[PDB]
């Protein structure tokens, strides 16, 4: 129980002028599970792969798809442990905000808060950045919202985004399949299709989790409801 | 350079590799295998079971206070697999937090709250370059109030997840795939049935073939509010039935 | 690589052996205890007439009846002197009389070696100071000259020299300077020894002398006084 | 080598060379001898200085009204440790108000010295201390290492070329126990001189004595009564 | 803090590395000259690198620590202004000046500020994981006396008073030309002192009135930083005087 | 001041309250909800001094939120009791809040009454605000100490209506909050006992009693 | 020292000799006729393929001389 | 059992020719029958990725 | 490996692909260097037998002793480096003293052992400090918890033993325990046995010379950790010598 | 262990530069065009919007135009990551100053508070410096309209017209060629800024998805901070685009 910590330079700039650690963290998120977020403008839908590659996992309460608060949720891609502390931390900020305002934290506000954390991990030494990309959803103040925060501590605004394996193809399939001024139903259908275009093959309702977000709140649907959806998609 | 990052620092301290995930973190999962302990845990609807070696190596080592089944607290108990030094250290930290929770928060502790709480801590240890990603893995049993009997396992990496069936140890991959065949050809879980499945997996995989003094079984039962070791009497009654099984 | 904190097979620390060398780099200072008083002499060694010679100081006051000449890195010493000023008046609040040469010197020396380069508090040294101080004054007990080292070994002297000429000068003092040599003769002894390390001859703009004598407080010698010792060397 | 980069650097044998290398620093220090009877604890010390035209500043330090120390090694570090001990001895006198035990005080030095040797990026303290102290259980003369281990000796010599002096300590080991104050000091001088070459025989000027005991508190004789112990000369006994 | 990694460690050469690295960075460039008058002290820097599109009014390279203490700074590289590095020394010195004036009713002297620069450099040396600033400052000011003073400091923290000194791009070369220009009349007439600063700056590289900025202090009155328009008129009159003597 | 009760019945938990929230015995506001809805699972009745009660519920709600999400167990009333006892101690026993925490665990529905004391108090059926004994006294009287859910719901509403009648402080609508652990039915008008008289007739005036010399919009 | 995975080079004159040395210790040819007295400064440097308990049977540590041992050496 | 190599000595070069030959002989267009070929290793990690 | 400037022996946060921690292991080789300390659990107490290293010719009793009293009824025998052992004595004694104050009953060995082990284990995890270079036994008698023997190594493990050895001879010494029935046996007879094991195991190159120190904590001392009488030591010494011949 | 890993990038070099600030200096140059020009009735900023897709939410006002206060606004050249933490901190500082003084904060006062922090990272601590260089635009009572630039150690310079980012030398020289020290009005000032952005940027006709331009204009004695919308921007593009067309002829 005797330590001061170490802070050392592998977290300072290289001669190239780009940060050595950020590139590696982006590599961790690319290796992850694919995750799509689509803002319907009738609600925000987020889809991820439920699986972890053995389906001896109970997951009826353990999910990749977790509500932070009454109508804001996070879906992730990338590293599982790092995400676990970020889920827990994000909630803690949400409730702090909840005490003062009475409204749950906006997606726009929440990301900056989370971003500081990602930043500490890069900039100080003896740590390393989180390797998790976040899709942050909400419906609040009369408009549904989708934000991206990548692992470096950047936040980017998109209305349809894809992640993980074949993040590039997902963004192009979204551009093509989904058009603007379509409804919520259409949005839900397109996400499962982006996941088909982003790791292909066999799907069960224990290989996918789909969660829908409204002002009613974020909920991850039960295994049965997800099953009906599967049959629709090619 | 090949054969580890020796001109680099990436296995020397915690920082991301040129390949994404750390050497050191992957390496921690290799420390488990050193312990010599393999644990198989099977989730039932009567009890959630742990079967681990009682096995002693001499007359000089206790067996009246040496066990790898630990009573974190009454409702929830756990098994540690891997390095013994790290094993005790997490158990005590877990015990103190369990009392403190019960005292302040007042909520009864399910499987999730201990599992998730430790997991977040073991993320901090992985994240600091002073501390090392853990040498042990914790497999918890305990009764969830909504679900029923639950078996969770948390990673030395800092991830928690639920399991109907799990295995940790020297033969982590061999036992989990073996137990996978048992799930697939499903068993309607009675008391005797979850205990039977766990011992047959471990007996085949190690290829020692255990007897009742060599294993100690841990149950947390739906009528027992406390954690209890079944000991030899119940194990032998199942043990014979195992030979008659297949 | 190896650290600097380590002990060598010689049986000494690296950082400290370097610090003694730092003392050797600077300008020479002579502090002579005579029983008529304590004189401190230092070389200015100016290279430009645009400088104002009063403000080149290397004699600074620890106390109002103790003067100190310092050698090696001029800057590195100054901090030790800043802490010394606070202690002498502090000593007046508590004891209700002024600090002695012995009391002040042992207290600064504790700080001299404390060094832990990594995993040591930022309110404590990473490296020792390369300064040798010569604390020369006459106090309640009488004329005393104490010498302080960067190794934090304090010892009482009657004649001590430190700076580039430190070994050479110290031997040469033991010879001329004795306790059968008066105070004015101590000033003449220091001036001769001073010249080898100096780049030029001795002058009243190339020495600074201050003597603290019994029954008197610290006096900084004026241009006339410097010039009377210059006439006969 | 690289068994001594930091004081956390182990050798395959299982030894930190820096802590050992810190002992070699004690050998650079000045010779000090520690002896005890049944009523006194006696410390005989070598003082050296750069000016011998001036009185030599003592190498015997004040810790308590019945505890005194003699240092061999690093001068700043010995004084540095001395202050922790001094604070505790004087504090022990306020609170407990016994004449504090040498065994008790010495273990507390063992906790503090262990801190840097345990800690990375630091140096051990390379100073060996001989403490004379008198409590109500009689004298004790203890040796404390650059490590943290202690010996309770009847006689010990740590310092420069201490082997030569031990040859004397081994020879009159029985005698120490019976002695009165005078006898302890004459033996320590005869021991002390041996460390140094054959043709050098001590002067009172460079000898400081710290005398502790039953009939006395703490008195340091720098030349005060040093002359009668020195008398009765014996020159380098082989 | 957690950072205690070495940046300065002592040399057997009897120096501190940073201090010497700083000292050469004032050899190689950023001409700052100061002369001390008999009513007024003037300090001048050459370069703010006014490329005829930059602002001249709000840019400060001469900063008022107090209303009777001012400093002009220099140390240069490829990163040419080390204004940032200066800006720390400037802010801590500013509070300290004001602070000294609250406690001690004498107006703060340059001699106090110079000891304060010697201790800031040093303090940064002793603290673990910390490094001395590269700055050298020409501390100008007024005492209790009301006597004009010009003092100069080095990156180690050693100070001397000087009637006239030049540093940058050959400290000794600019000063030895300037040495002829320092006469009894020049120091007496205030107007001649303003010209003396400008006249030195011109030796290294000639012309520019925008590149040259100088600040003037008269008595204990506040710092006045002169317009570049005032400088241009002054360089034109200096150039003709050179032809007159010669 | 306020009249709040919550009940343990043979169904789930029925909370009854008068509307009015008063700063002392005088109404700060004659609108909103005294019984507050928090997260989906937790409902809390409020009584005694207004200032102390609203804020206590709110602060505990964050703590309880953290504990619910991580643990993934439904909230326990004993659990809720301990959190209020610890928080209120932290503050140092300042102000008066008689608080009614009521949540459904996986077992039965559990109701507790925590007064400001910082006690570990287990009721049987409780009513709060006013005087703790005075409100509690009613439960022993009308309840036979268990009857069917529907009969019990009319019973609480009737007993709470009597306290509204007897004590004029409570005013406006009587709200009933039927609370499960995901279903929060907030029935504004269980009984309206009293309401005002219409403010149809003005007390307005033309400018000739006070006039205006400005109408401008600054920039 | 065989910990090889060396995706780039790694010599391997040395690899062949490390494997051949095992072969001669193995009882394809005797090992009751050849005994090996091996001296190496550390076993940390060495790999377990070599050490075993049927390549090198006894493990005799040599600590630095004791106090009595140095008097005997003199 | 070889590796990618290609910055090595002359010793890393000879191993590859032999390692190439084994591949074709097993499965290439040539293959065994009743006769069986047994390999012995210490590490399966020292082996060529193709092997 | 052992000669390096980054990680391995500098750190202990490091892992090899095997999983090893080399620094924690180097600490283990350090306990091995000095002579053996044995502590034997009886159903009635603990008896220790310790080699007390004679490092000079001007010895007095208790000099470089390895017998400590953690609590009134706990004794602690250390083996390996004595420098690290002194710091470990302060930490163990402190955890026990506060325990007695608060709980007001005799510290359970199972609890004390868990706390010191955690402390050793906090250092082995860390690369910021090295871990202790000794291994120790805590042994005790109480009637509130029974006779207990625990052992803590440089790694940070606490497990109970009924007869243990730490130090150079421990693999040989331990074997002699399997021979003896010691779980049920008076503390008076077991003193005779710890003394004879030590005399035979000692040789002139594990350490030059030793002084025999045996200690009681059992039915004889009435649950007090004390050093054995002059009489007890000598008869147990005699039996050691007679068995040695 | 720990020092060895520490690359000693916190060390001074003999020449008198910090290695880190110099490597940060390159990070600014990779990144897009941020230019600020002074005008005589207002002041304007033009920054490169790098978020072009056909599916964009626009949850923020802009991802490079940041209104730091209710009297200051800024644009970015560097890395978005550093920009986000930094932008928040810039807001607490601007806003506290507004509380005490109650007058718009000088552009010079705003760069200096941050500078201490930048410097702290570089010199010691082994902490990266921020990867963005900020162009702050404002009006403060004392000087009138001003533009301030900050660098990766907080080195400051007051500029009438300056540009950092991609093709920084090209943009600043060009702008130097037409305009030298405040020769134009607010109307003309937007048309130059978009023109410079046009040449520097790969798309040589631009749209409002490619550029985002922000104005800070002093109206009725009070500073108005407005991010101009896409509609206003197209008008400014057609004015420069047309001016370019005449040039050729």
Swiss-Prot record, chain E:
Glycans are attached at residue 136. SMART domains: Proteasome_A_N (SM00948). InterPro entries: Ntn_hydrolases_N, Proteasome_alpha, Proteasome_alpha-type, Proteasome_asu_N, Proteasome_sua/b. Ubiquitous. One of its GO terms (cellular component) is proteasome core complex. Belongs to the peptidase T1A family. The modification N6-acetyllysine is found at residue 233. The lineage of its organism: Eukaryota, Metazoa, Chordata, Craniata, Vertebrata. The modification Phosphotyrosine is found at residue 159. Signal peptide: none annotated. It is found in: Cytoplasm; Nucleus. This is Proteasome subunit alpha type-7. One of its GO terms (biological process) is proteasome-mediated ubiquitin-dependent protein catabolic process. Keywords: Acetylation, Cytoplasm, Glycoprotein, Nucleus, Phosphoprotein, Proteasome. CDD domains: proteasome_alpha_type_7 (cd03755). GO terms for molecular function: identical protein binding. SUPFAM superfamilies: N-terminal nucleophile aminohydrolases (Ntn hydrolases). Component of the 20S core proteasome complex involved in the proteolytic degradation of most intracellular proteins. This complex plays numerous essential roles within the cell by associating with different regulatory particles. Associated with two 19S regulatory particles, forms the 26S proteasome and thus participates in the ATP-dependent degradation of ubiquitinated proteins.
Swiss-Prot record, chain F:
It catalyses: Cleavage of peptide bonds with very broad specificity. GO terms for molecular function: endopeptidase activity; threonine-type endopeptidase activity. One of its GO terms (cellular component) is proteasome core complex. It is found in: Cytoplasm; Nucleus. GO terms for biological process: proteasome-mediated ubiquitin-dependent protein catabolic process. Keywords: Cytoplasm, Hydrolase, Nucleus, Protease, Proteasome, Threonine protease, Zymogen. Its EC number is 3.4.25.1. The keyword Nucleus applies. The active site is at 1 (nucleophile). Belongs to the peptidase T1B family. The 26S proteasome consists of a 20S proteasome core and two 19S regulatory subunits. The 20S proteasome core is a barrel-shaped complex made of 28 subunits that are arranged in four stacked rings. The two outer rings are each formed by seven alpha subunits, and the two inner rings are formed by seven beta subunits. The proteolytic activity is exerted by three beta-subunits PSMB5, PSMB6 and PSMB7. Component of the 20S core proteasome complex involved in the proteolytic degradation of most intracellular proteins. This complex plays numerous essential roles within the cell by associating with different regulatory particles. Associated with two 19S regulatory particles, forms the 26S proteasome and thus participates in the ATP-dependent degradation of ubiquitinated proteins. This is Proteasome subunit beta type-7. It comes from Rattus norvegicus.
From Swiss-Prot, chain I:
This is Proteasome subunit alpha type-3. The modification N6-acetyllysine is found at residues 57, 206, 230. The keyword Transferase does not apply. The keyword Isomerase does not apply. The lineage of its organism: Eukaryota, Metazoa, Chordata, Craniata, Vertebrata. One of its GO terms (cellular component) is proteasome core complex. Keywords: Acetylation, Cytoplasm, Nucleus, Phosphoprotein, Proteasome. Ubiquitous. One of its GO terms (biological process) is proteasome-mediated ubiquitin-dependent protein catabolic process. Belongs to the peptidase T1A family.
Curated annotation (Swiss-Prot), chain J:
The keyword Phosphoprotein applies. GO terms for biological process: proteasome-mediated ubiquitin-dependent protein catabolic process. The modification Phosphoserine is found at residues 13, 75, 173. Belongs to the peptidase T1A family. Component of the 20S core proteasome complex involved in the proteolytic degradation of most intracellular proteins. This complex plays numerous essential roles within the cell by associating with different regulatory particles. Associated with two 19S regulatory particles, forms the 26S proteasome and thus participates in the ATP-dependent degradation of ubiquitinated proteins. Ubiquitous. InterPro entries: Ntn_hydrolases_N, Proteasome_alpha, Proteasome_alpha-type, Proteasome_asu_N, Proteasome_bsu_CS, Proteasome_sua/b. The modification N6-acetyllysine is found at residues 127, 176. This is Proteasome subunit alpha type-4. It comes from the Eukaryota. It comes from Rattus norvegicus. PANTHER family: PROTEASOME SUBUNIT ALPHA/BETA. NCBIfam families: PRK03996.1. PROSITE patterns: PROTEASOME_ALPHA_1 (PS00388), PROTEASOME_ALPHA_2 (PS51475). The 26S proteasome consists of a 20S proteasome core and two 19S regulatory subunits. The 20S proteasome core is a barrel-shaped complex made of 28 subunits that are arranged in four stacked rings. The two outer rings are each formed by seven alpha subunits, and the two inner rings are formed by seven beta subunits. The proteolytic activity is exerted by three beta-subunits PSMB5, PSMB6 and PSMB7. Keywords: Acetylation, Cytoplasm, Nucleus, Phosphoprotein, Proteasome. Its main location: cytoplasm.
């Amino acid at each position: 129980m005797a330590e001061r910590g170490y802070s050392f330079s592998l977290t300072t700039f290289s001669p190239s002028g780009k940060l050595v650690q950020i590139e590696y963290a982006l590599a961790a998120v690319a290796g992850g599970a694919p995750s799509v977020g689509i803002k319907a403008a009738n609600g925000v839908v987020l889809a991820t792969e439920k699986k972890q590659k053995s389906i001896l996992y109970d997951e009826r309460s353990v999910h990749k798809v977790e509500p932070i608060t009454k109508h804001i949720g996070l879906v992730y891609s990338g590293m599982g442990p790092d995400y676990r502390v970020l889920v827990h931390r994000a909630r803690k900020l949400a409730q702090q905000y909840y005490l003062v305002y009475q409204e749950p934290i906006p997606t726009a506000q929440l990301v900056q808060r989370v971003a500081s954390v990602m930043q500490e991990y890069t900039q100080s030494g003896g740590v390393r950045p989180f390797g998790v990309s976040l899709l942050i959803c909400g419906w609040n103040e009369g408009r549904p919202y989708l934000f991206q925060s990548d692992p470096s501590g950047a936040y980017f605004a998109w209305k349809a985004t894809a992640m993980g394996k074949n993040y590039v193809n997902g963004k192009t399939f979204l551009e093509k399949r989904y058009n603007e001024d379509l409804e919520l139903e259409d949005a839900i259908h397109t996400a499962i299709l982006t996941l088909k275009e982003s790791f292909e093959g066999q799907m069960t309702e224990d290989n996918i989790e789909v969660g829908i977000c409204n002002e009613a709140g974020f909920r991850r649907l039960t295994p049965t409801e997800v099953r009906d959806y599967l049959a629709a998609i090619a | 350079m090949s054969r580890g990052s020796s001109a680099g620092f990436d296995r020397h301290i915690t920082i991301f590799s040129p390949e994404g995930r750390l050497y050191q973190v992957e390496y921690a999962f290799k420390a488990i295998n050193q312990g010599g302990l393999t644990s198989v845990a099977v989730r039932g609807k009567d009890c959630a079971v742990i079967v681990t070696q009682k096995k002693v190596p001499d007359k000089l080592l206790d067996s009246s206070t040496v066990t790898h089944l630990f009573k974190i607290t009454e409702n929830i108990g756990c098994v540690m697999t891997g390095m013994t030094a790290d094993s005790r250290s997490q158990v005590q930290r877990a015990r103190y937090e369990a009392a403190n929770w019960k005292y302040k928060y007042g909520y009864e502790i399910p499987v999730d709250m201990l599992c998730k709480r430790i997991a977040d801590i073991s993320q901090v240890y992985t994240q600091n370059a002073e501390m090392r990603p853990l040498g042990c893995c914790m497999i918890l049993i305990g009764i969830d109030e909504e679900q029923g009997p639950q078996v969770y396992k948390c990673d030395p990496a800092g991830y928690y997840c639920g399991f109907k069936a799990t295995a940790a140890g020297v033969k982590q991959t061999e036992s989990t795939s073996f137990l996978e065949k048992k799930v697939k050809k499903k068993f309607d879980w009675t008391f005797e049935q979850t205990v039977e499945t766990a011992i047959t997996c471990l007996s085949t995989v190690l290829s020692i073939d255990f007897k009742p003094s060599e294993i100690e079984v841990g149950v947390v039962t739906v009528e027992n509010p406390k954690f209890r070791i079944l000991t030899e009497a119940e194990i032998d009654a199942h043990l014979v039935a195992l030979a008659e099984r297949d | 690589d190896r650290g600097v904190n380590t002990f060598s097979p010689e049986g000494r620390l690296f950082q400290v052996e370097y610090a003694i060398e730092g003392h050797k780099l600077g300008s020479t200072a002579i502090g002579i205890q005579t029983s008529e008083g304590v004189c401190l002499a230092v070389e200015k060694r100016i290279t430009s007439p645009l400088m104002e010679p009063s403000s080149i100081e290397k004699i600074v006051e620890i106390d109002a009846h103790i003067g100190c000449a310092m050698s090696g890195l001029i800057a590195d010493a100054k901090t030790l002197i800043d802490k010394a000023r606070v202690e002498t008046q502090n000593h007046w609040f508590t004891y209700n009389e002024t600090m002695t040469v012995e009391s002040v010197t042992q207290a600064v020396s504790n700080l001299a070696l404390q060094f832990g380069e990594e995993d040591a508090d930022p309110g404590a040294m990473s490296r020792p100071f390369g300064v040798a101080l010569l604390f020369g004054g006459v106090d309640e007990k009488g004329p005393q000259l104490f010498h302080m080292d960067p190794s934090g070994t304090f010892v009482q002297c009657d004649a001590r020299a430190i700076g580039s000429a430190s070994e050479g000068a110290q031997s040469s003092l033991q010879e001329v300077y004795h306790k059968s040599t008066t105070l004015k003769e101590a000033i003449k002894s220091s001036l001769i020894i001073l010249k080898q390390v100096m780049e030029e001859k001795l002058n009243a703009t190339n020495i600074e002398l201050a003597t603290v004598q019994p029954g008197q407080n610290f006096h900084m010698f004026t241009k006339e006084e410097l010039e009377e010792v210059i006439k006969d060397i | 080598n690289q068994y001594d980069n930091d004081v956390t650097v182990w050798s395959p044998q299982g030894r930190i060379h820096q802590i050992e290398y810190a002992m070699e620093a004690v050998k650079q220090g000045s010779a000090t001898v520690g002896l005890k009877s049944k009523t006194h604890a006696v410390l005989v010390a070598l003082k050296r200085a750069q000016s011998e035209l001036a009185a030599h500043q003592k190498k015997i330090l004040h810790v308590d009204n019945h505890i005194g120390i003699s240092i061999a090694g690093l001068t700043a570090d010995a004084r540095l440790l001395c202050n922790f001990m001094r604070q505790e001895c004087l504090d022990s006198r306020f609170v407990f108000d016994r004449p504090l035990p040498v065994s008790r005080l010495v273990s507390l030095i063992g906790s503090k010295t262990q801190i840097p040797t345990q800690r990375y990026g630091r140096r051990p303290y390379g100073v060996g201390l001989l403490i004379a102290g008198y409590d109500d259980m009689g004298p004790h003369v203890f040796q404390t290492c650059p490590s943290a281990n202690y010996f309770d000796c009847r006689a010990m010599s740590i310092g420069a070329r201490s082997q030569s002096a031990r040859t004397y300590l081994e020879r009159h080991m029985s005698e120490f126990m019976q002695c009165n104050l005078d006898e302890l000091v004459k033996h320590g001088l005869r021991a002390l001189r041996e460390t140094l070459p054959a043709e050098q025989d001590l002067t009172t000027k460079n000898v400081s004595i710290g005398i502790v005991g039953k009939d006395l508190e703490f008195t340091i004789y720098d030349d005060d009564d040093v002359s009668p112990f020195l008398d009765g000369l014996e020159e380098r006994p082989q | 803090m957690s950072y205690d990694r070495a940046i300065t460690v002592f040399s057997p050469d009897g120096h501190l590395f940073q201090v010497e690295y700083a000292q050469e960075a004032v050899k190689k460039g950023s001409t700052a000259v100061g002369v001390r008058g008999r009513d007024i002290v003037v300090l001048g820097v050459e370069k703010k690198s006014v490329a005829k599109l930059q602002d001249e009014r709000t840019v400060r390279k001469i900063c008022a620590l107090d209303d009777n203490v001012c400093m002009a700074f220099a140390v240069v590289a490829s990163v040419s202004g080390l204004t940032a590095d200066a800006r720390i020394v400037i802010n801590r010195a500013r509070v300290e000046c004001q602070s000294h004036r609250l406690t001690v009713g004498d107006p703060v002297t340059v001699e106090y500020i110079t000891r304060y620069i010697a201790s800031l450099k040093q303090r940064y040396t002793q603290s673990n994981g910390r490094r001395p600033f590269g700055i050298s400052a020409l501390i100008v000011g007024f005492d209790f006396d009301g006597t004009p003073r010009l003092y100069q400091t080095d990156p180690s923290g050693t100070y001397h008073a000087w009637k006239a000194n030049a540093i940058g791009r050959g400290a000794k070369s600019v000063r030895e030309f300037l040495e002829k220009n320092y006469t009894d009349d020049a120091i007496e007439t205030d107007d001649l002192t303003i010209k003396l600063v400008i006249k030195a700056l011109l030796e290294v590289v000639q012309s520019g009135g925008k590149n040259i900025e100088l600040a003037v202090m008269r008595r204990d009155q506040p710092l006045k930083i002169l317009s570049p328009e005032e400088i241009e008129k002054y360089v034109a009159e200096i150039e003709k005087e050179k032809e007159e003597n010669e | 001041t306020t009249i709040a009760g919550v009940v343990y019945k043979d169904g789930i938990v029925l909370g009854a309250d008068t509307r009015a929230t008063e700063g002392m015995v005088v109404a700060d506001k004659n609108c909103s909800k005294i019984h507050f809805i928090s997260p989906n699972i937790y409902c809390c009745g409020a009584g005694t001094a207004a200032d102390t009660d609203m804020t206590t519920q709110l602060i505990s709600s964050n703590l309880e939120l953290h504990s619910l999400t991580t643990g993934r167990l439904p909230r326990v009333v004993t659990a809720n009791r301990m959190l209020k006892q610890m928080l209120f101690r932290y503050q140092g026993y300042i102000g008066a809040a008689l608080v009614l925490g009521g949540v459904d665990v996986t077992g039965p529905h559990l109701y507790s009454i925590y007064p400001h004391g910082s006690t570990d108090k287990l009721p049987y059926v409780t009513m709060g605000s006013g005087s703790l004994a005075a409100m509690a006294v009613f439960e022993d009287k009308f309840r036979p100490d268990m009857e069917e859910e529907e009969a019990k719901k009319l019973v609480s509403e009737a007993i709470a209506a009597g306290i509204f009648n007897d004590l004029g402080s409570g005013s406006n609508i009587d709200l009933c909050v039927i609370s499960k652990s995901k279903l929060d039915f907030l029935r504004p008008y269980s009984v309206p006992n009293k309401k005002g008289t219409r403010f149809g007739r003005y007390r307005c005036e033309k400018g000739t009693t006070a006039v205006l010399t400005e109408k401008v919009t600054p920039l | 020292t065989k910990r090889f995975d060396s995706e780039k080079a790694g010599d391997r004159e040395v690899q062949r000799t490390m494997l051949e040395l095992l072969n001669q210790l193995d009882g394809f040819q005797p090992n009751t006729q050849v005994k090996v007295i091996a001296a190496t400064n550390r076993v940390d440097i060495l790999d377990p393929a070599l050490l075993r308990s049927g390549r090198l049977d006894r493990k005799i540590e040599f600590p630095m001389p004791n106090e009595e041992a140095r008097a005997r050496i003199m | 059992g070889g590796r990618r190599f290609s910055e090595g000595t002359s010793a890393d070069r000879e191993i590859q020719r032999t390692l190439m030959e084994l591949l074709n002989q097993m499965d290439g267009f040539d293959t065994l029958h009743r006769v069986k070929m047994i390999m012995a290793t210490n590490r399966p990690d020292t082996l060529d990725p193709a092997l | 490996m052992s000669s390096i400037g980054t990680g391995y022996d500098l750190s202990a946060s490091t892992f090899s692909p095997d999983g090893r921690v080399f620094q924690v292991e180097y600490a283990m080789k350090a306990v091995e260097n000095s002579s053996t300390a044995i502590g034997i659990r009886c159903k009635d107490g603990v008896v220790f037998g310790v080699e007390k290293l004679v490092l000079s010719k001007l010895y007095e009793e208790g000099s470089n002793k390895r017998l400590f009293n953690v609590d009134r009824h706990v004794g602690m025998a250390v083996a390996g480096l004595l420098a690290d052992a002194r710091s470990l004595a302060d930490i163990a004694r402190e955890e026990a003293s506060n325990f007695r104050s608060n709980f007001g009953y005799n510290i359970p060995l199972k609890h004390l052992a868990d706390r010191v082990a955690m402390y050793v284990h906090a250092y082995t995890l860390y690369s910021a400090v090295r871990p202790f270079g000794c291994s120790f036994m805590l042994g005790s008698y109480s009637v509130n918890d029974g006779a207990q023997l625990y052992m803590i190594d440089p790694s940070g493990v606490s497990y109970g033993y009924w007869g243990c050895a730490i130090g150079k001879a421990r693999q040989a010494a331990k074997t002699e325990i399997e021979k003896l029935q010691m779980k049920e046996m008076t503390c008076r007879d077991v003193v005779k046995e710890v003394a004879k094991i030590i005399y035979i195991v000692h040789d002139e190159v594990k350490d030059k010379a030793f002084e025999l120190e045996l200690s009681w904590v059992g039915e004889l001392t009435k649950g007090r950790h004390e050093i054995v009488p002059k009489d007890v030591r000598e008869e147990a010494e005699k039996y050691a010598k007679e068995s040695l011949k | 262990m720990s020092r060895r890993y520490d690359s000693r990038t916190t060390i001074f070099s003999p020449e008198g530069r910090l290695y880190q600030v110099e490597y940060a200096m390159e990070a600014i140059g990779h990144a897009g065009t941020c230019l600020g020009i002074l005008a005589n009735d207002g002041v304007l900023l033009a920054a490169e919007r790098r978020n072009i897709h056909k599916l964009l939410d626009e949850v923020f006002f802009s991802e490079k135009i940041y209104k730091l206060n209710e009297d200051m606004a800024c644009s970015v050249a560097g890395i978005t990551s550093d920009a986000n933490v930094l932008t928040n901190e810039l807001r607490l500082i601007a806003q506290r100053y507004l509380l005490q003084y109650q007058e718009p904060i000088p552009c010079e006062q705003l760069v200096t508070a941050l500078c201490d922090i930048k410097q702290a990272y570089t010199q010691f601590g082994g902490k990266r410096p921020f990867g963005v260089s900020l162009l702050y635009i404002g009006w403060d009572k004392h000087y009138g309209f001003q533009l301030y630039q900050s660098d990766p150690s907080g080195n400051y310079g007051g500029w009438k017209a300056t540009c950092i980012g991609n093709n920084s030398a090209a943009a600043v020289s060009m702008l130097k060629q037409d305009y030298k020290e405040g020769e134009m009005t607010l109307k003309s000032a937007l048309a130059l800024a978009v023109k410079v952005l046009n040449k520097t940027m790969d798309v040589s006709k631009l749209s409002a998805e490619k550029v985002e331009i922000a104005t800070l204009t002093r109206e009725n004695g009070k500073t108005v901070i407005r991010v101009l919308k896409q509609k206003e921007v197209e008008q400014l593009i057609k004015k420069h685009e047309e001016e370019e067309a005449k040039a050729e002829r």
